[PDB]
Design a protein around this ligand. Sequence first.
Ligand SMILES: CCCCCCCC/C=C/CCCCCCCC(=O)O[C@@H](COC(=O)CCCCCCCCCCCCCCC)COP(=O)([O-])OCC[N+](C)(C)C
Ligand SMILES: CCCCCCCCCCCC(=O)OC[C@H](COP(=O)(O)OCC[N+](C)(C)C)OC(=O)CCCCCCCCCCC
Lengths: 622, 223, 79
Amino acid sequence: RLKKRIFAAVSEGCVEELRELLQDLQDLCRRRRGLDVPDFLMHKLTASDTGKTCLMKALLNINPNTKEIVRILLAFAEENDILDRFINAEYTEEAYEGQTALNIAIERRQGDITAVLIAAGADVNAHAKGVFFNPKYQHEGFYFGETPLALAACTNQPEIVQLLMENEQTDITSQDSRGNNILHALVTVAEDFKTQNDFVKRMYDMILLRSGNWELETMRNNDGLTPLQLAAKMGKAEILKYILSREIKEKPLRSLSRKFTDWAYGPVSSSLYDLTNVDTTTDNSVLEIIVYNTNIDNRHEMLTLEPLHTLLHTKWKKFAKYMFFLSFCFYFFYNITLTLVSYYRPRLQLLGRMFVLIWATCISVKEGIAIFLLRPSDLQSILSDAWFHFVFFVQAVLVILSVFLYLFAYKEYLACLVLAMALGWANMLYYTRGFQSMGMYSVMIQKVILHDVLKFLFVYILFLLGFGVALASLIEKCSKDKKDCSSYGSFSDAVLELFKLTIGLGDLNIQQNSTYPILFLFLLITYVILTFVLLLNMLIALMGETVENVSKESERIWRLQRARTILEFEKMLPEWLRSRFRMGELCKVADEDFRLCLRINEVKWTEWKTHVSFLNEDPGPI
Amino acid sequence: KYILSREIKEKPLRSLSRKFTDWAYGPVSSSLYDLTNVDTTTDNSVLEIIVYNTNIDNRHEMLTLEPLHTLLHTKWKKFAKYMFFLSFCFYFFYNITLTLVSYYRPRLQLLGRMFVLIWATCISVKEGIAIFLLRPSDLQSILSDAWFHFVFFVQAVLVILSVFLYLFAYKEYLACLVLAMALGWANMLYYTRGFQSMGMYSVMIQKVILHDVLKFLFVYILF
Amino acid sequence: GETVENVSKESERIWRLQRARTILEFEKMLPEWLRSRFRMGELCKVADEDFRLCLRINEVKWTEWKTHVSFLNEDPGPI
Ligand SMILES: CCCCCCCC/C=C/CCCCCCCC(=O)O[C@@H](COC(=O)CCCCCCCCCCCCCCC)COP(=O)([O-])OCC[N+](C)(C)C
Ligand SMILES: CCCCCCCCCCCC(=O)OC[C@H](COP(=O)(O)OCC[N+](C)(C)C)OC(=O)CCCCCCCCCCC
């Protein structure tokens, strides 16, 4: 019953009252035998229900006289000899299991009381496991990293980070319950420049350089993700751009950079980019992760970074350009051979029928595998990346069951064959990816069909069928001979007549066997006003707005899907021919370091600095 | 905007604020907004006043303030989404039943005729009340907020007097029935409000018809 | 085309306004027992003696970085 008065007094901030209550409590220690005076006292200062001690309650409430309160409480704990048992207490409920007083001092931005808590012997490995510090959804939880160094780095306070770093007791590479060390946590909380500043990038290089090794940046997450592949798997374009081209111009720490300058005579400079884990030589590279990431929208703005851009171009210069053209020739000849053995039906050099069957089996099997790997169960993905997978599969299986209907059951085998023919030529539209002009034209067809043509077809079909049934139900009996001026006779006949007025074909004839010629003209002219005037011209206007919006960012979407075909061609040719085409070369980067880097030359006429850190004193290619 | 989210961070005057912060650990923070007189629990709340204010043009820029935005979304998550879809199904089936007992005229399971009559009476009465409360005497208001009230009323009363002409006087009862059929399908265009894409497409049809198609029809009819 | 370009900046707001009109018209149509079933907020101890029945909105701000006083609950999280 005394502890409640202690907690109140320490929350309000009354210094003298605290002194008197602690004195009364020490007298309670005297005037009693008990079992263990420091233990019983620790039980008095602790709120057993939550584990919250008097010190943590002193720090949750900022109480402008709170520094004295911490000093008095630490002095009392020193009198009764329980300083470690006191200052290293945690919570004990599922919500905040692990939070210690150092954690509360670091996130309250108390740069003073935290030094007093460290010097008094805190635990710089807190590991606030909890379920609020490790949540399920985004809100109602933080996930700073489960460590006082991770919290001090994720709340943007470098002074406390420096205080934690230059300590012999801190464990800089302690992975938490997710597998994340400090650097996975920093690339987890990172956002863009407009939401937060660039403080996470600055704290990233601060922690990296101040430790100094590759050990911290090759640790494996619990998902097998280096802190680089994590930045690529969740689409942190800013901290990823920083990592991929990171140069340290200091002699002792030159080794842990990813971009070295070779010669740089005047303005001209040839800088080579480390390519170790950003090329598809191993499992889960950064190209494969960025290209095959059907879970983010930051892709086409992450393929423009320096190593990945020159990497994908070198691939569409060595082998991918020719495998693409070769695939186009094979599909073109398969389509022609399909449309000549189907248009020249009856009523040597006719092996084309079994050729079509062979390549239909090939395409069907291959595309079925691709669909099983793409996993299109997630919504919108089928229209997102695997539309042409699905379409190539449909057309190939259509040719299949048109052969397993022609001979096996002898039925109507023309519906499948003719559908397969028309679908084949639409797939040639797929093969426009190879050209920039003709290939980012085919990426506004997709945006325009989705946004504008679908909404127009919905409203137009409503009017077509509404006025079709109204006009049709206005016409009396067929005729005196069952067939005369019955253009708008039945439903489907009136719907066809209205469709032909929209296309502009035929001849408008209003002299119908109608009971009301005026009402007929009113409904028919209203239909003309609603579609020929409003809906079709409004389609052109909205389609102009869509083209204007998606013309700023259509080259990037095109380059992204061209990159998907490049990557799919790469993992298709054998390892001897694969080894024939490699991107970079082994270069002596440090005392003993071979990195197999790319090489990119550039010209800069603005900085004009004296050149040190060159990798080669004599310039030029030799 | 200032009043609805007004926080006083001082201990003696903390009481007269309308937005309190609960926990706010690091960056994350859970602030709760006082909702006393901005929710439609009483008479003349702030939602009812802002939404039913056919006298100002600042409305759609006042519904984006913090309590009112999350308030209207919570309503179109608990009950309004399903009452809307349910109303759309009832009107769709009333239209089909109207267009099958009118296209399959002569020369069990035909209670559809009295169903149409019943729901025509319902819609006519209800929409007539809504028009008397909307008070469309002020200019441009009928095109502003009660266009679909007027159109639903016209179509329902058309079906009415096409029944009170078919049997009571035995006259030309097809002009009313057929006009009512075509008007019914235009009212389905009303029911596009439920979706963002398809529903703010139907709000450029309104702006385009008013500004561009009317002026064009005037000059074109002259020529 | 000129009209579409002008009213495309402010068409989501007009739409949300008329969707709000149907929401409000559906509200004042269902009975008070079913109405009481759906309430937006909850009674929360705001002051010494003040129940306000407030909403609740979470947010994330990475710029201000101030020491936190005036919190309504010292221990964080939903509990
Ligand atoms: C600006 C405009 C834009 C276009 C707007 C188009 C709007 C649509 C316009 C359509 C109107 C066209 C005329 C329809 C009626 C014709 C008569 C007829 O055949 O009736 C038959 C049905 O016929 C059909 O069902 C038609 C064919 C299928 C529907 C049309 C394609 C669907 C859209 C595809 C979209 C694919 C998209 C791409 C997908 C990858 C029934 O006849 P019956 O009663 O059995 O006859 C009995 C007596 N007899 C047997 C002696 C005969
Ligand atoms: C999504 C698809 C878009 C494309 C259009 C497809 C359909 C085209 C027409 C096919 C007609 C057909 O074939 O049958 C239509 C059938 C029977 O027709 P029938 O009266 O016997 O006339 C046959 C005449 N012959 C023999 C000369 C061919 O129903 C009807 O008459 C019922 C009409 C009223 C109900 C439908 C109203 C719809 C309103 C709008 C809802 C959104």
